[PDB]
Design a protein around this ligand. Sequence first.
Ligand SMILES: Cn1nc(-c2ccc3c(c2)OCO3)cc1N
Ligand SMILES: Cn1nc(-c2ccc3c(c2)OCO3)cc1N
Ligand SMILES: [Cl-]
Ligand SMILES: [Cl-]
Lengths: 139, 133
Amino acid sequence: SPGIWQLDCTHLEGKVILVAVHVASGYIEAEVIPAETGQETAYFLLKLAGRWPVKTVHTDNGSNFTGATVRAACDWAGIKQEIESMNKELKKIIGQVRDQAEHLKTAVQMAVFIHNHKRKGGIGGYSAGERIVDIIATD
Amino acid sequence: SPGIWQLDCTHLEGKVILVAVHVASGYIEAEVIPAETGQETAYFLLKLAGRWPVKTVHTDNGSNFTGATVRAACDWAGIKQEESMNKELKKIIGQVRDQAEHLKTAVQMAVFIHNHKRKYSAGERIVDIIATD
Ligand SMILES: Cn1nc(-c2ccc3c(c2)OCO3)cc1N
Ligand SMILES: Cn1nc(-c2ccc3c(c2)OCO3)cc1N
Ligand SMILES: [Cl-]
Ligand SMILES: [Cl-]
């Protein structure tokens, strides 16, 4: 279950954002992509799998996962295929920082930063970033 | 020290790749970027610091770091400013190059192979070091 991620799309300002959540920790990797296509989805998946030990991705099973490119990426990376709060928590933070960035993509990364660093248990709490690392180090 | 990363540029096929290395593990984050500008550098650094606990980046201190935007980014993310796997990464990019239509895909395959290669991987090492703390 350390290797399980959920991947979803979210949309803002006519642009596409892919959001991957590490199910066990709530840690997020997210990016504006140029189009919800097989090619760009395969790219985002290859990027994620090269940074974290991704075994399984739960996805919406939509059009951008049916093509030979994404299947080929998943195969290659050793990944098998088998929310809304995140995507709206993420939206909220994005709205909160939207002013200070020219480009949506910058705000997206600021939002991912705040989400992964936020310690919400007070003095005891763990950030999503501390949680992913603890879970994966444990195994 | 867990929070220390080294950031360098490398150039292939007329395009610019930023490579961040987590010094204690050898783990790598790397991306083709549109141009070696302060804007794009600031963006790559914000991405990195949102994904790992970056305290200090050692950079080449060149032009893309002197501007309002990168300074502002580092300040905001709480980063202070104070290349072996860089030839290695090009080697891996050389080996996978045929299978990618686009260089940026080869780059990410190369990052994948570098971070997962065992014989602990760099990916296991960064997580152990940072969990340690
Ligand atoms: C102290 N510490 N910090 C982290 C940590 C790990 C990943 C992160 C992060 C913090 O912010 C963005 O992504 C893990 C531990 N043990
Ligand atoms: C088993 N295992 N695998 C990892 C691991 C962590 C990060 C990675 C990776 C593997 O490949 C690409 O980036 C960490 C542990 N403990
Ligand atoms: Cl999607
Ligand atoms: Cl640089």
